[PDB]
Short mmCIF file of N, CA and C and ligand atoms in Angstrom, two decimals:
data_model
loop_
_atom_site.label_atom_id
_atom_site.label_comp_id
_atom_site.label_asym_id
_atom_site.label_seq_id
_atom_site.Cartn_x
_atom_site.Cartn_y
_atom_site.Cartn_z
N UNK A 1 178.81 39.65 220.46
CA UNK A 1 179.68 40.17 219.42
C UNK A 1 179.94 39.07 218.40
N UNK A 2 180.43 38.14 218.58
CA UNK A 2 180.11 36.84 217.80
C UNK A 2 178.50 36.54 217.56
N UNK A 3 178.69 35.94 216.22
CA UNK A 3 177.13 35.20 215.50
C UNK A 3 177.26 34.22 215.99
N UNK A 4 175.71 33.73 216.24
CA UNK A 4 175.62 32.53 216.90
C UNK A 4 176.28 31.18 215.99
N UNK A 5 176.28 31.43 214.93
CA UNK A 5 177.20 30.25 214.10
C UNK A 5 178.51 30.54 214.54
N UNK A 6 179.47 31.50 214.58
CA UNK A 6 180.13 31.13 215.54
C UNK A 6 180.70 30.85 217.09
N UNK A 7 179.61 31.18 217.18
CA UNK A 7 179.72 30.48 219.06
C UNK A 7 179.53 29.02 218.95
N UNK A 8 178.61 28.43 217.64
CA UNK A 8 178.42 27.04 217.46
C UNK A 8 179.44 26.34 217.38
N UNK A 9 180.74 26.73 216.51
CA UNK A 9 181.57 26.49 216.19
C UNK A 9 182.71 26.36 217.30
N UNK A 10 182.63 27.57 218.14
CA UNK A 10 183.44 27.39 219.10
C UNK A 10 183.44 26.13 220.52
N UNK A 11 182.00 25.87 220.63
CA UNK A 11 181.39 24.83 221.46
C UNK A 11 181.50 23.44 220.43
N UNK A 12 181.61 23.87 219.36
CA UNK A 12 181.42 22.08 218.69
C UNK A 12 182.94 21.54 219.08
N UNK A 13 184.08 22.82 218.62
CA UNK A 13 185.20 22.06 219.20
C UNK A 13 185.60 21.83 220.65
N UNK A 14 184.87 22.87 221.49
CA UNK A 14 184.98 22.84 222.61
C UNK A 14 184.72 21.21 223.24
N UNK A 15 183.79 20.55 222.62
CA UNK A 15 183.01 19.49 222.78
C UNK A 15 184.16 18.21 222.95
N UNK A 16 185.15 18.71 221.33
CA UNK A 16 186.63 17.87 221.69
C UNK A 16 187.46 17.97 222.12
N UNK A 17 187.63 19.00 223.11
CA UNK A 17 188.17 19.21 224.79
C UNK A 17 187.76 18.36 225.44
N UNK A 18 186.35 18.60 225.42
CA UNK A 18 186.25 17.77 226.51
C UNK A 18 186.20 16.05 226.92
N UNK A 19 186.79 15.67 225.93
CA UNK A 19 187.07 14.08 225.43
C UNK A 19 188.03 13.83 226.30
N UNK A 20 189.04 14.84 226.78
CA UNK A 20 190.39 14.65 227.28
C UNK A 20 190.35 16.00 227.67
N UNK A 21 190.24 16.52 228.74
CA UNK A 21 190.50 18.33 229.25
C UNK A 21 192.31 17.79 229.69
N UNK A 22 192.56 16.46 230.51
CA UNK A 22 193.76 16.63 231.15
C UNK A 22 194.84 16.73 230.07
N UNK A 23 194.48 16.00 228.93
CA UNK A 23 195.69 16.16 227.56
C UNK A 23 195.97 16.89 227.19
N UNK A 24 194.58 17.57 226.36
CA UNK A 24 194.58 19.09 226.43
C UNK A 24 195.24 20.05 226.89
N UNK A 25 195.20 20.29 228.15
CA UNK A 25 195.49 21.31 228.95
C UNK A 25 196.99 20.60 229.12
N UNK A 26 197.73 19.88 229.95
CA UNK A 26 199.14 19.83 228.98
C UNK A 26 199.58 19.82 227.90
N UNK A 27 199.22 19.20 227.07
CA UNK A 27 199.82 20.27 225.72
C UNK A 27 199.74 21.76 225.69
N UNK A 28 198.86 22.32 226.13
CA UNK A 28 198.71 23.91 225.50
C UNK A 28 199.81 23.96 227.01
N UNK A 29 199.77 23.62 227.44
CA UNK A 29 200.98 24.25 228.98
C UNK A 29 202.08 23.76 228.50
N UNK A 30 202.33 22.89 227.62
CA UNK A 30 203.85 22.55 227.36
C UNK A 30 204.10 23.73 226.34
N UNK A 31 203.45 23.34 225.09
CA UNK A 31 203.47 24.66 224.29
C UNK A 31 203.65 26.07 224.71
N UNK A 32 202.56 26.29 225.60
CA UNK A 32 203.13 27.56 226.21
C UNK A 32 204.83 27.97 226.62
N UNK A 33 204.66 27.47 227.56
CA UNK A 33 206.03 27.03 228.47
C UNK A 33 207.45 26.75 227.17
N UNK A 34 207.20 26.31 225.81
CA UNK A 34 208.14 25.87 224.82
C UNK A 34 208.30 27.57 224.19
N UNK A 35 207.48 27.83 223.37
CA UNK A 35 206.91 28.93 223.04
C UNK A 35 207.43 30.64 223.60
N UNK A 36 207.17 30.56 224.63
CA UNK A 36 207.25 31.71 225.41
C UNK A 36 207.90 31.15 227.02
N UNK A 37 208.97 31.08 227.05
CA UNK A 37 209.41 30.79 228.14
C UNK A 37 209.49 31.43 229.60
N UNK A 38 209.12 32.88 228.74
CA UNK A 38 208.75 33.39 230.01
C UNK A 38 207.75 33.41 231.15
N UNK A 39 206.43 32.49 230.55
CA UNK A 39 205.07 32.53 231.47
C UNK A 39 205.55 31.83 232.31
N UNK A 40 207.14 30.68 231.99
CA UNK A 40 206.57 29.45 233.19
C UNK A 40 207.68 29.82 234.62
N UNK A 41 207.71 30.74 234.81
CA UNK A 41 208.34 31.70 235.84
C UNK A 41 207.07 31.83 236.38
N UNK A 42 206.34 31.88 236.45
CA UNK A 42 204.90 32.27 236.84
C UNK A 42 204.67 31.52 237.91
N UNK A 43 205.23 29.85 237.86
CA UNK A 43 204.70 29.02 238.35
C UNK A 43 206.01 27.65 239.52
N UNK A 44 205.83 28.49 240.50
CA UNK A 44 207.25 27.91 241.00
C UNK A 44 207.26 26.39 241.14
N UNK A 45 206.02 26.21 241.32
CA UNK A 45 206.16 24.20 241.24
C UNK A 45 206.24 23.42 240.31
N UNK A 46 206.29 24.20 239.21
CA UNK A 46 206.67 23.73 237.64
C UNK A 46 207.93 23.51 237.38
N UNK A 47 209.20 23.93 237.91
CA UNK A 47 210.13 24.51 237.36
C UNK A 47 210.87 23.31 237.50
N UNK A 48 210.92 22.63 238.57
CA UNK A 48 211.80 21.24 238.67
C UNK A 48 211.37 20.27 237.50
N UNK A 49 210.11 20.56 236.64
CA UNK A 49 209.57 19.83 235.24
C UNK A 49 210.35 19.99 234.37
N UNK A 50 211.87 19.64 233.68
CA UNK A 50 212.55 20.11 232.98
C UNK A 50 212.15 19.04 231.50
N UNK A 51 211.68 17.81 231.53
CA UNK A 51 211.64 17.42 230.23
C UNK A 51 210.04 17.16 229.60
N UNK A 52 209.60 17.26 228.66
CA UNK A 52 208.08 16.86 228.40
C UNK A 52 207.31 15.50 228.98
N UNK A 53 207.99 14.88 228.88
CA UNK A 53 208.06 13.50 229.94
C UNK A 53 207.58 13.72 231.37
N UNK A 54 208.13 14.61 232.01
CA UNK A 54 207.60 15.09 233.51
C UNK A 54 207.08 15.46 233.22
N UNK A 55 206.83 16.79 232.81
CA UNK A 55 205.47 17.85 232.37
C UNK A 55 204.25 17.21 232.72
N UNK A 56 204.09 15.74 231.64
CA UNK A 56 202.98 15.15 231.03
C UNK A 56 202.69 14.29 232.26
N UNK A 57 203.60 13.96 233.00
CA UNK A 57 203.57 12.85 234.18
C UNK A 57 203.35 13.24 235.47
N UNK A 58 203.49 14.62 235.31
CA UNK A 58 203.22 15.52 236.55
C UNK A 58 201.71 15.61 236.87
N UNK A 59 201.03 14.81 237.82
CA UNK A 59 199.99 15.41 238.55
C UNK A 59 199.24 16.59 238.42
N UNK A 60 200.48 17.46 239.31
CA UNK A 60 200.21 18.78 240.04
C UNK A 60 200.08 19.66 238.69
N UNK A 61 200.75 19.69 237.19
CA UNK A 61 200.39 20.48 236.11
C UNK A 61 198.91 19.73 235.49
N UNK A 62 198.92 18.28 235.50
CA UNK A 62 197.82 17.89 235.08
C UNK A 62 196.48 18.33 235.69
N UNK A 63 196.52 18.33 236.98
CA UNK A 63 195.22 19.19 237.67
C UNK A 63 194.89 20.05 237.10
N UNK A 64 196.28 21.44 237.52
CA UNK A 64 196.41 22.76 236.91
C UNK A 64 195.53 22.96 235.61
N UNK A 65 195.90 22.14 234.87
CA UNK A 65 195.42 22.07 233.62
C UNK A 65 194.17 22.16 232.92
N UNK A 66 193.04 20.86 233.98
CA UNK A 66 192.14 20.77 233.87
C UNK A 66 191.01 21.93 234.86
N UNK A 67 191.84 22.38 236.04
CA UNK A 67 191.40 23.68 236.25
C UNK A 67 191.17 25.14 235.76
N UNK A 68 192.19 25.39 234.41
CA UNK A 68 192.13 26.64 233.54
C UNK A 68 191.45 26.05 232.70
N UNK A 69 191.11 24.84 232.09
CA UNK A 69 190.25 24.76 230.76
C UNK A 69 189.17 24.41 231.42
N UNK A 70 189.08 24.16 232.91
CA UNK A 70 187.54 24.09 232.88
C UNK A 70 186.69 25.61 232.84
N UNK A 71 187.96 26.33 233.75
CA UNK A 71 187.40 28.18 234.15
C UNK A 71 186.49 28.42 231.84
N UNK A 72 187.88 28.39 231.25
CA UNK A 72 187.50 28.79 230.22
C UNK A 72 186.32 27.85 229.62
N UNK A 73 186.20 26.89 229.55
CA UNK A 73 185.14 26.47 229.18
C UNK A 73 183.96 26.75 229.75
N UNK A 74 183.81 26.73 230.55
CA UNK A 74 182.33 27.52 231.99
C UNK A 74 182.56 28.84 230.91
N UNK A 75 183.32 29.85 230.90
CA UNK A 75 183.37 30.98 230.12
C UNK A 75 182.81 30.92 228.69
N UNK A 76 183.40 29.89 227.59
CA UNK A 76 183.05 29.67 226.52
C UNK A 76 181.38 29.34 226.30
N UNK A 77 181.12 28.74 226.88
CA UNK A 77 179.90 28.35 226.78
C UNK A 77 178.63 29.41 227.33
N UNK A 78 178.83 30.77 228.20
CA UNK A 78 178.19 31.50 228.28
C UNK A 78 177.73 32.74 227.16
N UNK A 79 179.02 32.62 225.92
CA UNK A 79 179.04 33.06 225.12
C UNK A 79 178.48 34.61 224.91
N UNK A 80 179.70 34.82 226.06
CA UNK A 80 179.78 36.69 225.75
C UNK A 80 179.05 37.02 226.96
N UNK A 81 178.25 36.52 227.51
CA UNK A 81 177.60 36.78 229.00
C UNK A 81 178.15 36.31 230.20
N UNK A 82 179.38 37.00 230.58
CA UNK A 82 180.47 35.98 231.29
C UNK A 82 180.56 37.17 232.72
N UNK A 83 180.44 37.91 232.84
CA UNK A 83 181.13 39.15 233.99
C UNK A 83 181.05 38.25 234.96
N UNK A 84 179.96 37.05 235.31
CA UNK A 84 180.27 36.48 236.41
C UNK A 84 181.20 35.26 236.40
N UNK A 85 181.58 34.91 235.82
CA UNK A 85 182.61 33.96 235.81
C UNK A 85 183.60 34.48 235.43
N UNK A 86 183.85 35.36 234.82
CA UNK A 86 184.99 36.30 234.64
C UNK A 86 185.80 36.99 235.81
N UNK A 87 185.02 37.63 236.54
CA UNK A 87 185.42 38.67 237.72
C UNK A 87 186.46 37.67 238.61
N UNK A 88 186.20 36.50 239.38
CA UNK A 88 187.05 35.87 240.15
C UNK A 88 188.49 35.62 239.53
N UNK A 89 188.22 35.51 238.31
CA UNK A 89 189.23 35.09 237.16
C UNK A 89 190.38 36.59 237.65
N UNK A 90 189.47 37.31 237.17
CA UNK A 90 190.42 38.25 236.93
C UNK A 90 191.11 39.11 238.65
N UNK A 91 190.03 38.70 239.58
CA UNK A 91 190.84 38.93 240.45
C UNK A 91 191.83 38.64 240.76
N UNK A 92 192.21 36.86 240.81
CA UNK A 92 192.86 36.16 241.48
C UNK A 92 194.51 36.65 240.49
N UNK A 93 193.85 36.89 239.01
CA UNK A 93 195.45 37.04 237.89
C UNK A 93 195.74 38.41 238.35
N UNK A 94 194.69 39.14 237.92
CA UNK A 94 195.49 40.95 238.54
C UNK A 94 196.04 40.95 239.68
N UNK A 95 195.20 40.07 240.87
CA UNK A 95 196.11 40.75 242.40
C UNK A 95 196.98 39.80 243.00
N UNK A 96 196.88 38.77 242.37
CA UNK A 96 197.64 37.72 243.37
C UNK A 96 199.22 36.84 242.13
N UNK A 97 198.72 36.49 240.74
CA UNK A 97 199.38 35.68 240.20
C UNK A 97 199.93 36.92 239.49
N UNK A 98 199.25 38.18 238.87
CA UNK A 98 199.99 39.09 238.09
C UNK A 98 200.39 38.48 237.05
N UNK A 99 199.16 38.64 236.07
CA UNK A 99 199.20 38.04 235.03
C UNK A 99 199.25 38.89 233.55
N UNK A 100 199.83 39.09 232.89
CA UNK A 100 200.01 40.38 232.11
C UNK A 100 199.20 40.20 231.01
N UNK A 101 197.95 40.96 229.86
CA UNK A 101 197.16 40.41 229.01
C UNK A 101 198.16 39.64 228.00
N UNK A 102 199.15 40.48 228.04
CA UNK A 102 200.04 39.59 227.12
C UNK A 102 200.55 37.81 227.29
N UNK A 103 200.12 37.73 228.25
CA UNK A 103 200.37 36.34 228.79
C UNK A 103 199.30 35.37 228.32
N UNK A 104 198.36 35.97 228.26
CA UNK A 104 196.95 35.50 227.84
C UNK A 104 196.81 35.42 226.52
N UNK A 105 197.57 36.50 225.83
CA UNK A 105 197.62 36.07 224.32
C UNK A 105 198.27 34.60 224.04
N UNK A 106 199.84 34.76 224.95
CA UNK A 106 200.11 33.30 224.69
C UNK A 106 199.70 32.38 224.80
N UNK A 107 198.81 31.88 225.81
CA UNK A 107 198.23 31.22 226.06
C UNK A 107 197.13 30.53 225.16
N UNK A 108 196.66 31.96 224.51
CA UNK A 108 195.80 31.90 223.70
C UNK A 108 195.96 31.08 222.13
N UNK A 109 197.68 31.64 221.81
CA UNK A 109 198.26 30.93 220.67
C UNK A 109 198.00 29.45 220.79
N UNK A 110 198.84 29.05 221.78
CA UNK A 110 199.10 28.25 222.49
C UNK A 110 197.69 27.28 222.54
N UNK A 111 196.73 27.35 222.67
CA UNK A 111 195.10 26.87 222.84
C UNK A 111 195.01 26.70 221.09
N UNK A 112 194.94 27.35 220.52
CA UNK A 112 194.96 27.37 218.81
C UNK A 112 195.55 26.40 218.49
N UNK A 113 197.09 26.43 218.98
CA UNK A 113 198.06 25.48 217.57
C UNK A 113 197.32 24.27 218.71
N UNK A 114 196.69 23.45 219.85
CA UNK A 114 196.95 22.62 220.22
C UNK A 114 195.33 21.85 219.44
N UNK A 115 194.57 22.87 219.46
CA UNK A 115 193.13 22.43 219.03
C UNK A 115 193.16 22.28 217.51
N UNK A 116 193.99 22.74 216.85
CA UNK A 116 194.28 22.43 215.20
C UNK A 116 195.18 20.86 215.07
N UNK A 117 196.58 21.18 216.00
CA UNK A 117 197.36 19.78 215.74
C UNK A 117 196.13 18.62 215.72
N UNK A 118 195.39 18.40 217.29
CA UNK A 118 194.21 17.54 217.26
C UNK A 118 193.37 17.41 216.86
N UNK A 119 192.71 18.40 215.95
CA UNK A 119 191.25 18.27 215.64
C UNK A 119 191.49 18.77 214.16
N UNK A 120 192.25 18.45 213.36
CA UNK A 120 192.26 19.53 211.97
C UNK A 120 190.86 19.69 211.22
N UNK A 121 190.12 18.32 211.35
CA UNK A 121 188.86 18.36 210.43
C UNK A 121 187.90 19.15 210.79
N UNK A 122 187.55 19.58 212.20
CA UNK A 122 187.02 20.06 213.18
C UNK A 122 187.54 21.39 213.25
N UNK A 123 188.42 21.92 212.79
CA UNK A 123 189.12 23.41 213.30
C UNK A 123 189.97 24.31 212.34
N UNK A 124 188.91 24.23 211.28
CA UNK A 124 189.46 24.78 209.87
C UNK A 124 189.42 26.34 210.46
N UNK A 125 189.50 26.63 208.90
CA UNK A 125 189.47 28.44 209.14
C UNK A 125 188.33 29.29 209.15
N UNK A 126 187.11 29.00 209.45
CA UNK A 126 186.26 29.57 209.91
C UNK A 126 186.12 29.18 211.67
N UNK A 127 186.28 27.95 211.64
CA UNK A 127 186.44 27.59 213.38
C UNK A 127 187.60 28.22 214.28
N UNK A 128 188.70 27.92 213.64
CA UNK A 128 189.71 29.05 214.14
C UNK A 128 189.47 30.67 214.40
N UNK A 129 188.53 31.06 213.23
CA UNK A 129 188.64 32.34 213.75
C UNK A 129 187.64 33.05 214.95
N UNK A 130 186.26 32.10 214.71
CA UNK A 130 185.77 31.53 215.52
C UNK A 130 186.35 31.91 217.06
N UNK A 131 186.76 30.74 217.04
CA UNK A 131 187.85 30.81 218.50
C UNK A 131 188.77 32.15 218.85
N UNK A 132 189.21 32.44 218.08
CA UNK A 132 190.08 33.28 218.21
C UNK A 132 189.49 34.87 218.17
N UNK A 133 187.80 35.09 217.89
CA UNK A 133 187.56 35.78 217.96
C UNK A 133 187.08 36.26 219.67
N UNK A 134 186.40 34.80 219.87
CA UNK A 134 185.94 34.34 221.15
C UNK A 134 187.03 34.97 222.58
N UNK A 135 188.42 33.91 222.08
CA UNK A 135 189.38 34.17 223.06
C UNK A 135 189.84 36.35 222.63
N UNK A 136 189.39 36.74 221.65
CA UNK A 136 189.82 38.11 221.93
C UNK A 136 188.82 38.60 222.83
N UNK A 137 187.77 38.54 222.45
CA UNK A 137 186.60 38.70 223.55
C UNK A 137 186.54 38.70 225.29
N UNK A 138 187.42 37.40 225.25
CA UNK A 138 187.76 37.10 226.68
C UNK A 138 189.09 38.10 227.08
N UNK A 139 189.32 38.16 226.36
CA UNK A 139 191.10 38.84 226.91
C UNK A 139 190.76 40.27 226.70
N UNK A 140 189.46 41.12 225.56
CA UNK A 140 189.05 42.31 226.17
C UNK A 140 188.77 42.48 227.28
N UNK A 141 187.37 41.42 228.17
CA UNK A 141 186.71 41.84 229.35
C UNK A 141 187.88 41.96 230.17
N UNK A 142 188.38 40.76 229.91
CA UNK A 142 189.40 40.50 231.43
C UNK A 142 190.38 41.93 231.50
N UNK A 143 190.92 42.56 230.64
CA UNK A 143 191.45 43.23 230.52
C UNK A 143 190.87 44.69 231.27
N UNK A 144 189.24 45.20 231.14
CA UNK A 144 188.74 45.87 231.76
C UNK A 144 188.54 45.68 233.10
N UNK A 145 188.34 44.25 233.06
CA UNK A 145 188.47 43.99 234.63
C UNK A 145 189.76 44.11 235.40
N UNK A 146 191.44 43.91 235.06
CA UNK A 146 191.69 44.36 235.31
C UNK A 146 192.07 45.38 235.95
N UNK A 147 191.66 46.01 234.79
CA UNK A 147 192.00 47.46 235.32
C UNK A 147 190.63 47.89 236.09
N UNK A 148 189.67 47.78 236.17
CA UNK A 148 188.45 47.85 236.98
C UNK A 148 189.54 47.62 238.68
N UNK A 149 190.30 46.64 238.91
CA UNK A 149 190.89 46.54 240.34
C UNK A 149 192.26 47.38 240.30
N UNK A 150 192.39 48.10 239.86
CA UNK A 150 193.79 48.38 239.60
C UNK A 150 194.81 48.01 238.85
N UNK A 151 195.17 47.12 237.95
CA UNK A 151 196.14 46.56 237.43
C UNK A 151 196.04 46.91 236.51
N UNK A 152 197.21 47.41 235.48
CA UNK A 152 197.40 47.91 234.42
C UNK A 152 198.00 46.66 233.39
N UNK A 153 198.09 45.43 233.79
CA UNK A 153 198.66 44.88 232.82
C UNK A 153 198.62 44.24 231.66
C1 HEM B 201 192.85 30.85 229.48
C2 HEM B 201 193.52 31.56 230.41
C3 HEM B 201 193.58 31.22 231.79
C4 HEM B 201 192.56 30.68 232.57
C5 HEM B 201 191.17 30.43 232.25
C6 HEM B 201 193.14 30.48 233.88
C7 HEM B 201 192.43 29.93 234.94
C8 HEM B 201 192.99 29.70 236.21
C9 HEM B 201 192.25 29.14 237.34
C10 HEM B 201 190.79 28.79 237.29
C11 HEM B 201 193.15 29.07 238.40
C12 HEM B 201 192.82 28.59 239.79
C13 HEM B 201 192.11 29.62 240.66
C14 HEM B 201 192.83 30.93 240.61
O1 HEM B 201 193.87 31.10 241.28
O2 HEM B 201 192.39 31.83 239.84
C15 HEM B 201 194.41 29.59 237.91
C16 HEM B 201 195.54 29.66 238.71
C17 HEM B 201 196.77 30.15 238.30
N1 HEM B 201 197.00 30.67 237.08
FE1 HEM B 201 195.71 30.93 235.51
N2 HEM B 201 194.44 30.85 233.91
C18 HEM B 201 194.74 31.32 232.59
C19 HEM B 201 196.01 31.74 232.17
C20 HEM B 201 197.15 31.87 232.97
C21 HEM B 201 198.45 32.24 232.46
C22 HEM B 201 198.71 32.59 231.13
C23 HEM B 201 199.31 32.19 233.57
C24 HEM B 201 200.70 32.46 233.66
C25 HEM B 201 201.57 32.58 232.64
C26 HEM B 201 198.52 31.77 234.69
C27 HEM B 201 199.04 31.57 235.95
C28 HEM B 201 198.37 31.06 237.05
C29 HEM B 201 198.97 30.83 238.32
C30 HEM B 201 200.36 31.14 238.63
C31 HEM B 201 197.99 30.24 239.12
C32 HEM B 201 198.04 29.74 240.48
C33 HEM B 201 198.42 28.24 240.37
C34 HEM B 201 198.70 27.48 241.64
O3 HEM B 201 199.43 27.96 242.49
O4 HEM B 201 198.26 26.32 241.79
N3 HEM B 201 197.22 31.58 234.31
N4 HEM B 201 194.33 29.96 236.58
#
């Protein structure tokens, strides 16, 4: 569904993820968590993290971190040919974490403002949309998958 110029686009910045996945992925989890306060109910070993200071110093979110941007990156880079790296994804959020698509949008914001603050030269407005066309892409399938197991959310 994306042109291959922008899948290029989405992997060129992807590329400056991966310079730092653990930074990365706390920021877009602090953001999140700032943002929408409701995702970080989600996550009961987070919750004693009350200042950005812990957040960032925390281990156990820093792993976390580099574990969802790696899932999505393995995803990004298949570029639209994903059902198999997708499906576990979506099991584990529909039946076990109950993850609502709307959560995924945030997340999704959340991935945007963090790859613009860092990369502005790199993540103009064709790269952004780029991405953002990408991450709708992802949050369609998952969404069928979903509901493919039951979950309506
Ligand atoms: C880009 C979107 C996301 C990706 C790629 C992603 C990926 C992952 C991966 C790979 C895991 C570990 C294996 C598993 O349990 O599935 C995981 C765990 C988890 N995810 Fe997600 N995730 C995303 C968004 C979210 C959002 C938005 C929430 C909640 C607001 C969430 C909540 C959780 C929870 C609660 C766990 C289990 C963590 C643990 O106990 O250690 N995820 N996620």
């Amino acid at each position: 569904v994306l042109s291959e110029g922008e899948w290029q686009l989405v992997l060129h910045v992807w590329a400056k993820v991966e310079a730092d996945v653990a930074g990365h992925g706390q920021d877009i989890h602090i953001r999140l968590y700032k943002s929408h306060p409701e995702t970080l109910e989600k996550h009961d070993r987070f919750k004693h993290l009350k200042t950005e200071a812990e957040m960032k110093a925390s281990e156990d979110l820093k792993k976390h971190g580099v574990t969802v941007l790696t899932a999505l990156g393995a995803i990004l880079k298949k570029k639209g040919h994903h059902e198999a790296e997708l499906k576990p994804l979506a099991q584990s959020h529909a039946t076990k974490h109950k993850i609502p698509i709307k959560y995924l949008e945030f997340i999704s914001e959340a991935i945007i403002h963090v790859l613009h603050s860092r990369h502005p030269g790199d993540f103009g407005a064709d790269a952004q949309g780029a991405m953002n066309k990408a991450l709708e892409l992802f949050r369609k399938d998952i969404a069928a998958k979903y509901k493919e197991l039951g979950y309506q959310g």
